């Protein structure tokens with residue numbers, strides 16, 4: 001219905017705003033675009049579902065997220081990929097893991113403050129009816 | 131259930147085999163890998179959901195296709211993207227469009243010959259129950 005289309009449009013507006021705020025944070029530059037294969041040649045083989053903030057924006061615009069829960073799955077994927085690909089004790093690995101956890105924590109904290117629980121419940125109920 | 135897992139595993143085996151047969155055809159080399167942005171800088175902006183045969187293989191392996199119908203949507207996407215991005219009368223554009231239609235036609239013809247309709251119906255009924 002028209003009311004449901006308006007609901008998903010509001011969701012997309014909300015998710016774009018959250019994603020933009022993550023993307024302009026200097027700490028998260030490494031997660032903003034797909035990896036350069038020249039910098040990490042084995043990334044494609046080790047990480048089976050790459051994800052980054054530009055890809056998240058494309059998915060929002062393709063109407064791939066019908067709930068904030070589904071969006072957070074991709075944010076969690078950005079984090080889990082980083083922990084998987086950079087598990088070593090070396091400072092470079094530790095920096096990226098810290099930034100990955102910070103990205104995750106920041107996204108969840110924004111959502112906790114700014115997402116109305118009843119709005120999310122509505123989205124979930126519309127999704128389950130499709 | 132175990133029987134349903136076996137069904138989706140058989141689907142994945144079937145889809146990998148079809149995709150491999152498309153990927154080794156010389157006509158379809160242009161569709162085997164993501165586009166090189168150096169060759170087509172405006173591709174990212176014009177085509178909103180890029181798709182290629184290596185991406186299709188990754189999606190099979192990530193369990194993204196529960197039916198042949200969903201797989202054919204991505205094959206159709208490879209074709210529609212090509213028709214959209216190369217619409218001109220020039221020979222280069224006409225060649226790619228012809229190959230795109232041939233890819234689509236070939237995938238459908240393989241499926242028509244080799245996919246049991248009752249196998250596809252089972253997949254669809256399992257998908258709809260989830």
Ligand SMILES: COc1cncc(-c2cnc(NC3CCNCC3)c3[nH]c(=O)c(C)cc23)c1
Nearest residue numbers: 030034035036039040081082085086092093096
């Ligand atoms: C423009 O700079 C880059 C572009 N693309 C990828 C990276 C990058 C480089 N190194 C990583 N990890 C190494 C750190 C030192 N120990 C070996 C691994 C990276 N790890 C990542 O998770 C991502 C997303 C990029 C990246 C950088």
Ligand SMILES: COc1cncc(-c2cnc(NC3CCNCC3)c3[nH]c(=O)c(C)cc23)c1
Nearest residue numbers: 160164165166169170211212215216222223226
């Ligand atoms: C290694 O060669 C390539 C790598 N990546 C992309 C292409 C490519 C080049 N040109 C295209 N179309 C032009 C043909 C002449 N008129 C202007 C457009 C391409 N079109 C496509 O649809 C794809 C997938 C690649 C491609 C080639």
